[PDB]
Structures are given as structure tokens and as C-alpha cells.
């Protein structure tokens, strides 16, 4: 519920890897299809994420995701810490719904992220995250 908390996991589809980041308090989502489930990709993703949102802490359902020196170096540089304390199903649901409209899985993934973030439920996840962060600054 704290505005700086994110959750990061990889899920699989069509023999590819989808990295999914969830802003816990809002439900807001960012995702990329990555070539390999490696620390290098995770580190690079964290750097991008941190330059865009105020990322303070990151949770995951697989702690071994964060063991690589590349990941530790990214968290160090960006000032992130990890912690031990379903979007994957919902995302895969939406992906299946728009899948036939794109050739590439990565395209379908971004269409799914779009739909999820804008969907009204009375505000959208996209609206919630900006309100939460903005309120937290002032
Ligand atoms: C902020 C920051 C800077 C560099 C690295 C790093 C880092 C830290 C490394 C790296 C690279 C290439 C980077 C960084 O690339 C990414 C994709 C991992 C981010 C780079 O372009 O220099 N490479 S490695 C292991 O071959 O991938 C060389 C290295 C060797 C041993 C440990 C290690 F963490 C690194 C890092 O993980 C985080």
C-alpha cells in the first residue's frame, strides 16, 4: 500500500518470457517481453522502471531473481532495496483476448497492458498511480 512498493515477476507464454512489474497500491502495470530470464535483463528493466517512477522497494515471488551482481548493482545505483513479505492470470486473460490482432506476442502484451491500465474500476490503475504518487509528493 506504500506508494514506493513494486512487485516484479516473470511469467511464460508461447515459449517466451514476459517480465511483469506491478505498482502494488494502484494495480498499475508495466511489462516487457524479454529474450532471456536473466539478471542482466532484470537489472536493465529495474533501471528503466526507477527512472520513471519513485521505486523504493521491490517484491517478487522468486527471491533468486535478485541474486545476480548485475541486479544488486542496479538496485544500488538507483537506490532500491528488496524485501520478502493475480496479475499474471489477468494479464494472460487480456493477452488471449487481443492476441489475434497482432503477429508478435510483445505487441499483444503492450495492448494488454494498455487495456489493463486504462480500464475503469471509480478510477483506472493508470489514474490511481499518478494520484497516489502526486499526493505523496505534496
Ligand atoms: C547501474 C549498473 C551499471 C552496470 C551494470 C552492469 C554490471 C554491474 C555488469 C555487467 C554489465 C554489462 C552491466 C551493465 O549491463 C546491464 C545490462 C547488466 C545493465 C552495463 O551496461 O554495464 N557485465 S556483465 C556481468 O557481463 O553483464 C560485466 C559485469 C561483470 C561482473 C559483475 C557485473 F555486475 C557486471 C549494472 O548491472 C548496473
CA angle 65, 11, 100 (to 5 degrees): 155
Q: What residues are paired with 12 via a beta bridge?
A: 17
Q: Whose CA is nearest to atom 18 of ligand 1?
A: 40
Q: Any known ligand binding at 100?
A: no
Closest Cα partner for 19 from 39, 34, 40, 5?
34
Closest Cα partner for 21 from 55, 63, 72, 70?
55
What whole-number distance in Å separates Cα of residue 85 and Cα of residue 75? 18
Q: How far is the CA of 136 from the centre of ligand 1 (A)?
A: 32
- Residue of 36, 39, 43 best suited for mutating to test ligand 1, as the one with most atoms within 8 Å of CB: 43
- What phi, psi does 104 have (nearest 5°)? -80, 135
CATH no. of 2-138: 3.30.420.10
Q: Any known ligand binding at 61?
A: yes
Q: Tell which atom from ligand 1 comes closest to the C-alpha of 72.
A: 37
Amino acid at each position: 500500500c506504500s506508494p514506493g512498493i513494486w512487485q516484479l515477476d516473470c511469467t511464460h507464454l508461447e515459449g517466451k518470457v514476459i517480465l511483469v512489474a506491478v505498482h502494488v497500491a494502484s494495480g498499475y502495470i508495466e511489462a516487457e517481453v524479454i529474450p532471456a530470464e536473466t539478471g542482466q535483463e532484470t537489472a536493465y528493466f529495474l533501471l528503466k522502471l526507477a527512472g520513471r517512477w519513485p521505486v523504493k522497494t521491490v517484491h517478487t515471488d522468486n527471491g533468486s531473481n535478485f541474486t545476480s551482481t548485475t541486479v544488486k548493482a542496479a538496485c544500488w545505483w538507483a537506490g532500491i532495496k528488496q524485501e520478502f513479505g493475480s496479475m499474471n492470470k489477468e494479464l494472460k486473460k487480456i493477452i488471449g483476448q487481443v492476441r489475434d490482432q497482432a503477429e508478435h506476442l510483445k505487441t499483444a502484451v503492450q495492448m494488454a497492458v494498455f487495456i489493463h491500465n486504462k480500464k475503469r474500476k471509480g478510477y483506472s490503475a493508470g489514474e490511481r498511480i499518478v494520484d497516489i504518487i502526486a499526493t505523496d509528493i505534496q
